[model samples]
Target chain A: INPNKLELEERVVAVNRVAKVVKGGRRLRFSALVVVGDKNGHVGFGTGKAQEVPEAIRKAIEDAKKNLIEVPIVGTTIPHEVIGHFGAGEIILKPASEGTGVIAGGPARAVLELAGISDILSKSIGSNTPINMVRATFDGLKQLK
Target chain B: INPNKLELEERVVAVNRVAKVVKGGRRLRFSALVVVGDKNGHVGFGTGKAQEVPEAIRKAIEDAKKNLIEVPIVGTTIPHEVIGHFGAGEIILKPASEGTGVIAGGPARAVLELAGISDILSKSIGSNTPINMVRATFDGLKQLK
Candidate 1:
């Protein structure tokens, strides 16, 4: 099913400003990393760069909708432990019993909550770059089965 | 420094007996999976098979010592979260706060404890085979730079 049509939730993981050197001086742009999920096992992450912050976020949400994946959830947590990596970014995800809530850093937490995982333990290590961290979380989610 | 001279800790992860068809009935051999570490970051896993359980275990421990790798420890836990994979076995490990204790299953637990990780979280998914699980734990620890 299309995630957007199923009441998807969107979270912004990070936002950055970039500059392009030009003959005259420099051109500034905005980049955003976004995650979208249906809160029932489906999730995805995307990045978009644009001249405006709103446009960048909009583009990111659209991109996320197209790259959705399924995560395996058992009760309030994941079925097992998973480690995901992208570039130098590495994230570990573990299941927690009910009432533990979600213990994760900002980037990883946004993805986990939207994915409908209520009780989980997570940590991000290695590179902390926003896009890489988002990709790492996505990579970990894909490994779930 | 010579690792042998140091006070290394060894934990036996698993032991099993297998039979082979021979001209004279069946021949039985013992297989053991052992994990060794200094309980301060270095850890390794090895498997050995022999006619006796003690011999197999001893061989496995020696093999483990030869393959040791360093793991990053922060406080009583790991520096970050990581996942390790071998064959069908997938293991996820996460850092835990003080007094949280090591939350892991059989093979994974042995490795974590010997590595001197007192507060951590882990789960073994996919294949639960002891050898694979131990190998997967090693795989994850190797990535902890």
Candidate 2:
């Protein structure tokens, strides 16, 4: 289904209030990592930085929408196992039985559930940073074929 | 369970025969990638080269045992999703529910099944070379904690 008519679900994985040092003082900004999914195996992830949380999230949503990917879901879970890595972050995803539910930690859980994976297993290894973890998850999902 | 007492299983993922031109003729050698696992949580991968396929596999098994790492198993599968990369090879591993079975390709399938993963999903992206793919699977499993 097309994103516009698909009724996408969004989750905020991480929000960081970053500061930059200026001549007079320090300037503050917000960075948000957003994951969007149609809960039907279509998902995407993006990062946005802005002066405000809402603006950052809004930008992140737009960015996420720009690069969506479709995953192969078998029944309530994924078709197979996938390991995705970005920088130092590595994510592992596996399909679960109907009753297993979604067993994932923070960032990964957000992405999986949003993508409509009801029964699955997930792990975030190495770097636990949100942006990298989300990116790694997306990378793993993109390999589902 | 006592790791030392656990019966470790070994699988030869791939074997390649190569030739070297000498002053007189060509010499043949074999290279093998091997995976060893306890079928509980520990696993490792290694590569070995020798004059014959059996010798190469034997050497690889020894090397693999020396590099074992424990993986986190939730039920019959991995705890989460993880992606591993070595050189150009990328492997994605995901957990699966009961009866789903292990869905994987050559090298990755050998590693996962020997490691004791029953129901799981796997994909090999990028390079398909046995050495790199096996190494990537080990890399992903090593991150389990």
Candidate 3:
């Protein structure tokens, strides 16, 4: 367990199975998605692939714990507004008033809120796909300046 | 690119580290967390650890993409309110209004929003660490009814 952190959470959303036919018997594999976070300014997420579901989740948890990011907050909001784009996915972020709260749509909205942005506005364009939305969110967050 | 399903909206959150052993050489490892989604009510997350950052990220992304889940949305919100627990973490989720947006207090919020829950409320309990919070969020999401 990490000591520097206070609260911790984890979840296994889905499990998948894949089979490959070879000269011998068929090879099967399992894949999993694991989400990890500390409600505070730090959170991490990871994915794991293995022959078993348990092993995949275990690997993902370890990765998330190591990759937690510390977001900079500006008086209960973000430092500034920004936009992120990746592979046909686009996200726009804006600062909001205290009571206004997080006015966001799609994946961009969730990522920012978890980063501790209490008041912010977000929009998503392009594919609107979850993967693209998340990629755009990361692009925007990583480029925060 | 996967033809059956193309999930382009994906985000990767990860970290890098190096360790020195008392006996000798240094060890380098990477931990990664990835969120995947289609933006249409399907989303997943995963984590991975490996000797290389890219390797870990690749593994995490692949796993997360495969373990995608289908969440039922009730007019832009979750189908219903739910709560989940895992390890020392707990997560509570509730539907919200359009303007209310995502009133989440932990990783659970991030997971929900990415999965396509527009107006919702979430709370994370326990240590509030990234992994624990995320797990709790996934647990809560999976229990949706």
lDDT of 2 by residue, B1-145 (tens): 3436667765545555432211001015666666777777877777777753435656777787778787888888888889998888898888789888888765677677777888888888878866677788878887776
Best lDDT goes to which candidate?
Answer: 1
Off by over 4 Å in 3: A1-145, B1-4, B14-27
Interface RMSD (Å), every candidate: 29.7, 27.8, 15.7
How high is the CA lDDT of each candidate model?
Answer: 0.72, 0.70, 0.61
Per-residue lDDT of model 3, residues B1-145, tens digit only: 2414754454443233443211100125556666666657777777877754445656776788777777788887887788879899887888887777877753455566567777887766575765577677777778886
DockQ class, candidate 2: incorrect
Estimate, for each residue in A15-108, the C-alpha lDDT of model 3 and write its tens digit: 3443321101101465544445554666565667775344665786687677666666778777787788888988887767788777765345
User: What is the DockQ (computed on Cα atoms) for candidate 3?
Assistant: 0.02
lDDT of 1 by residue, A39-134 (tens): 898888887777544456568778888898888898989999999998999999888999998887667777887889999988877787666777
The positional error of residue B115 in candidate 1, measured at the CA in angstroms, is 63
Q: After superposition, how far is residue A27 of candidate 3 from its true place, in Å?
A: 37
lDDT string for model 1 (B1-145, tens) is 3577667766555656433211001014666677777878888877777754445656877888788887789889998989999888898988899999889876677788778899998877768876787788888888887
